[PDB]
Design a protein around this nucleic acid. Structure first.
Length: 89
RNA sequence: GGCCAGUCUGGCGUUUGGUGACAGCGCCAAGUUCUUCGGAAUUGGGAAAUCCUACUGGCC
């Protein structure tokens, strides 16, 4: 399954390993860009090979709706999506 | 299995760079070489290669 915009991931490789992040842009089949709105904010999002992430079965509608209407997402909305995701699991 | 590119002594920490193995930075250790004894250089294996072990990324 292709990675989705607004989907939560767990980082499995790299120095940001074992953290949770949000997919904010899909380059192709291989590469995405992730950001958490805190230590890794949108304006310097982290490029990632999708093989170095673990797809979590959770997609935040707030993140993907904001990209559909404004073409962007705020760091506060990213922090909200991750904070809400952790509270349900 | 083939072709190409890359990484290297170990432990803890890390808002930094890298897709990544890793690296950078702080601290504690280890090996090798040199020393005027104050220190200095260096770090997978190999005498060395377009070589090889392990690991990472790409194409098949």
């Amino acid at each position: 399954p292709s990675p989705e915009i607004g989907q939560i991931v767990k980082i499995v490789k790299g120095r940001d390993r074992d953290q949770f992040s949000v997919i904010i842009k899909r380059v192709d089949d291989r590469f995405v860009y992730i950001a958490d709105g805190d230590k890794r904010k949108v304006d310097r999002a982290k490029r990632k090979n999708m093989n170095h992430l673990k797809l979590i079965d959770h997609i935040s509608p707030e993140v993907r709706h904001s990209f559909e209407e404004t073409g962007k997402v705020t760091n506060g909305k990213l922090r909200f999506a991750l904070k809400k995701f952790l509270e349900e699991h």
